[PDB]
Amino acid sequence: CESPQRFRCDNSRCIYGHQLCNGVDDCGDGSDEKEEHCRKPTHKPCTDTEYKCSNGNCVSQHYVCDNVDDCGDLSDETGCNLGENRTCAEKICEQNCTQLSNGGFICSCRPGFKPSTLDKNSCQDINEC
Amino acid sequence: DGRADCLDASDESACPTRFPNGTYCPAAMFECKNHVCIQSFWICDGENDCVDGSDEEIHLCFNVPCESPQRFRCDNSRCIYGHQLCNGVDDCGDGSDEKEEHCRKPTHKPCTDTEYKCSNGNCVSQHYVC
Amino acid sequence: PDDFQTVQLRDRTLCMPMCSSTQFLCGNNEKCIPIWWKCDGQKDCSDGSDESDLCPHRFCRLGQFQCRDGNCTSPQALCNARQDCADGSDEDRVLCEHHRCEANEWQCANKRCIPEYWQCDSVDDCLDNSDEDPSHCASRTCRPGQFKCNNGRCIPQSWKCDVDNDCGDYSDEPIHECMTAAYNCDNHTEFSCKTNYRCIPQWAVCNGFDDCRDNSDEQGCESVPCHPSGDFRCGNHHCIPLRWKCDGIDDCGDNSDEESCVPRECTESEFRCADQQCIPSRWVCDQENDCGDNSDERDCEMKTCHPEHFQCTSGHCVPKALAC
Amino acid sequence: CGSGNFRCDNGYCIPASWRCDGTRDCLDDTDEIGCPPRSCGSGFFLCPAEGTCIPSSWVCDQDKDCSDGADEQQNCPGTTCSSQQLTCSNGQCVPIEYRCDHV
Ligand SMILES: *[C@@H]1O[C@H](CO)[C@@H](O)[C@H](O)[C@H]1NC(C)=O
Ligand SMILES: *[C@@H]1O[C@H](CO)[C@@H](O)[C@H](O)[C@H]1NC(C)=O
Ligand SMILES: *[C@@H]1O[C@H](CO)[C@@H](O)[C@H](O)[C@H]1NC(C)=O
Ligand SMILES: *[C@@H]1O[C@H](CO)[C@@H](O)[C@H](O)[C@H]1NC(C)=O
Ligand SMILES: *[C@@H]1O[C@H](CO)[C@@H](O)[C@H](O)[C@H]1NC(C)=O
Ligand SMILES: *[C@@H]1O[C@H](CO)[C@H](O)[C@H](O)[C@H]1NC(C)=O
Ligand SMILES: *[C@@H]1O[C@H](CO)[C@H](O)[C@H](O)[C@H]1NC(C)=O
Ligand SMILES: *[C@@H]1O[C@H](CO)[C@H](O)[C@H](O)[C@H]1NC(C)=O
Ligand SMILES: *[C@@H]1O[C@H](CO)[C@H](O)[C@H](O)[C@H]1NC(C)=O
Ligand SMILES: *[C@@H]1O[C@H](CO)[C@H](O)[C@H](O)[C@H]1NC(C)=O
Ligand SMILES: [Ca+2]
Ligand SMILES: [Ca+2]
Ligand SMILES: [Ca+2]
Ligand SMILES: [Ca+2]
Ligand SMILES: [Ca+2]
Ligand SMILES: [Ca+2]
Ligand SMILES: [Ca+2]
Ligand SMILES: [Ca+2]
Ligand SMILES: [Ca+2]
Ligand SMILES: [Ca+2]
Ligand SMILES: [Ca+2]
Ligand SMILES: [Ca+2]
Ligand SMILES: [Ca+2]
Ligand SMILES: [Ca+2]
Ligand SMILES: [Ca+2]
């Protein structure tokens, strides 16, 4: 029983790959479904050209400060070199602006729209199909 | 020291890093979650050599080789020594050891040339025949 | 390589990354990483050179920057020319000397660095006109098929002349132009709205969505005839085929279909089983469990399998060809 | 220099735990120099710039017992030659017979 395509149970019995966490005790010892095997993956360490987030998440260096929350926990946009007042009144973002407590803003598009790939300040339409 | 001097193994239970490898014991040895070390041979052989039973977590048993005449393998994929096979003890908890299939008496050899046959399933040298 | 620097100490030849004062270099001179990564507590280098015993204890979140007092501050603050960290590690002359700005950043004559995208966005992020200077900002001709407006934004050409203020400054709504003959609508594939200068695909005219923001497109459709046979009706006055009444899908939208699922009562020509399944009466005794609960054949007498058949202890009949 | 750290060299920071254990950790030796002097007695002497106490007989013995030299730098009397000896400008005592012998 090759380990990636097939699985072996503590009872020295073999089970197919998908069965390993299907939620059924395919092998009666209940080794299949063990939390040791089923627990969530170990996220890859952030590589060069990337950035680190409090969230255990890695973000491409370009995304690190573009007025969009890419780290999920806002760890990317927080703390950029402010310069002039980044007030929402500039109307830089096309559809939505949110002012941060420490100045600066983060932007979101309305449902059905996602920030554009080449200009995250603009919005493009999701091809839901 | 790597030897359980407390029955509960509480002595080794808090041993610091013993080797810079982060491991507690050297090569040609086996290590247990209680920070107690045992000869690798004792792994999965029907005896909790490690008091916490970590030396034979059943998942470990599949790897150890067991030649059929000197050692025996049980239906639980656990190995037992040759003499244990019919000693009258369930050395392996599946009770494969002591099975009548294995323990039943031998098959007597067929009578060869220069011999004679007996109703008893017995063979006698031709000279002894009368 | 040309991404490295070449030096020889006595006779041996050594190759070293040309990284700046804001970065740290690891064992074997294999790779260079931002200085904040050095003691963050995560082994970043290809070897243990990242957090050897020389790194002091770690006091804050991953990826942040630490100061010689014992306090942490975010990393982009490192050389912004203002002491965000009172320890003065921030703006440390050793680190800012020979300063260089990372690829996610752009640098201006003010000896200041701003995120690369912030350039030409109407805000003087460099604290001076350098990042907004119209000389370098001009001539930013966006891609073909796009449209450019007075807000300094580029937008899909199709989005022009719709009441959606997409440019933010209403520049994409030249009302006088939008109502010109060129913008006029193709009656064979489009539809027009009663109170707006907008055109929508004809299929959209009725779909349950206000394709015209004035709700004028859908106003016409109302038909929902509740046919009496082969159909079922729902509390919210919606009708669906009878088969849909009990299928695990809430088709009515109010669960009125699925909540009343009671096994159909069998007719006088049928028989009932443990799952209340209904089977023709002929099936009750034929030596096959037409109902998987064996409702049939369990009550019947122990009759025998007529010729050309084989029998099983379960009270089943099988053709002889199948026997072996 | 650092947090939770000690500084004893130009541009260098060293762990505080290393200080005061006899180990010459600082290449410039300051790890032991500032350890507070620790009381001692019963015939022993303690010297500045170290947290070390040494037998009193050693203090003036011509050996540098403390790295700063306080044991020999402190005031203690000199010595002179016996009637059986001769002295010369080297600060030396030599047998009197050698006074005039072509050697
Ligand atoms: C900049 O923003 C601050 C609030 O963070 C506000 O108090 C200040 O008046 C603003 N200055 C200008 C010139 O907009
Ligand atoms: C902005 O976003 C909020 C939700 O975050 C939403 O309620 C609001 O309608 C949006 N406005 C625009 C103009 O997109
Ligand atoms: C690390 O483990 C090896 C066996 O794999 C052992 O021989 C060695 O002593 C350990 N590390 C050292 C050098 O102490
Ligand atoms: C570091 O932070 C502490 C509080 O966490 C504060 O007392 C101390 O003054 C700070 N250091 C400096 C140099 O301000
Ligand atoms: C399209 O329909 C409108 C309304 O019937 C009409 O006024 C217009 O002339 C038509 N245009 C064409 C090109 O058929
Ligand atoms: C990520 O994976 C490694 C092995 O590659 C370890 O399982 C580690 O525990 C994981 N990381 C975390 C944070 O648990
Ligand atoms: C214990 O193990 C860890 C991980 O390997 C470290 O090596 C640590 O240095 C060890 N502790 C001691 C005091 O040796
Ligand atoms: C003797 O041995 C053979 C196999 O070598 C069979 O097991 C056979 O069943 C035995 N003989 C009898 C009489 O049972
Ligand atoms: C077995 O049953 C069939 C009907 O299914 C016939 O009655 C047949 O005569 C029976 N055979 C015997 C031997 O009783
Ligand atoms: C010097 O010391 C010696 C002992 O070696 C004698 O006491 C001698 O008398 C001393 N001489 C002087 C001048 O003090
Ligand atoms: Ca399973
Ligand atoms: Ca971002
Ligand atoms: Ca064992
Ligand atoms: Ca036995
Ligand atoms: Ca690190
Ligand atoms: Ca700063
Ligand atoms: Ca700008
Ligand atoms: Ca528009
Ligand atoms: Ca519609
Ligand atoms: Ca349904
Ligand atoms: Ca039937
Ligand atoms: Ca068959
Ligand atoms: Ca020391
Ligand atoms: Ca001395
Ligand atoms: Ca002489």
Give the nearest partner residue to C115 out of A80, A90, A92, using CB atoms. A80
Residues 6+ apart with CB under 8 A from B22: none
Q: Does ligand 4 come within 6 angstroms of the Cβ of C97?
A: no
Query: Comparing C-alpha atoms, which of B43, B71, B81, B36 is closest to residue B59?
Result: B43
Optimal mutation site among A11, A13, A14, A37, interface B, most CBs of chain B within 10 A: A11
Within 13 Å, how many C-alpha atoms sit on residue A100's CB side? 19
Q: Are C24 and C35 in contact (CB under 8 A)?
A: yes
Distance C164 CA to ligand 7 centre (A): 64
Q: How was this structure determined?
A: cryo-EM
Q: Which chains contact D through at least 3 pairs of Cβ atoms less than 8 Å apart?
A: C
* Nearest Cα residue to A76 out of A92, A101, A56, A59: A59
Strands C309-312 and C316-319, sheet pairing: antiparallel
- Would you say B96 and B103 are in contact if contact means Cβ atoms under 8 Å apart? no
What residues have a C-beta under 5 A from ligand 24, the ion? D 61, 63, 65, 71
For a ligand 7 pocket test, name from B17, B18, B21, B35 the mutation site with the most ligand atoms within 8 angstroms of its C-beta.
B17
Give how far the C-alpha of residue C236 lies from the chain's centroid of Cα atoms, to the nearest Å.
Answer: 33
Helices and strands of chain D, counted as H and E runs: 3, 6
Is the separation of the CB atoms in A16 and A6 below 8 Å?
A: yes
The alpha carbon of B92 and the centre of ligand 2 are apart by a number of angstroms equal to: 68
Distance CA C69, CA A26 (A): 57
Q: Are D66 and D49 in contact (CB under 8 A)?
A: yes
Closest alpha carbon to C306 in C279, C285, C280, C281:
C285
Closest CA to ligand 1's atom 1: A85
The first and second tokens of residue C201, run together, are 């695909």
CA–CA distance from D86 to each of D31, D61, D83, D98 (Å)? 47, 22, 8, 8
Measured in angstroms, how far is the CA atom of residue C250 from the centroid of ligand 20? 5
Instruction: Determine the residue type at C2.
Output: D
Q: C-alpha C188: how far from its chain's center?
A: 36
Q: How many beta-carbon pairs under 8 angstroms link A with B?
A: 14
Q: Is A62 on the interface with C (CB under 8 A)?
A: yes
C144: which 2 tokens?
């073909």
Which helix (H) or strand (E) element contains residue B101? helix B100-103
Ligand 7 centroid–CA B14 distance in Å is 13
SS3 (DSSP) at D47 = coil
**Integer distance in angstroms from the first to the last C-alpha of chain B?**
72
Chain C residue nearest residue A94, CA to CA: C168
Give CA–CA dist D63/D76, Å, rounded: 13
Amino acid letter, D10: N
Q: Relative to the alpha carbon of C303, which ligand is closest?
A: 9
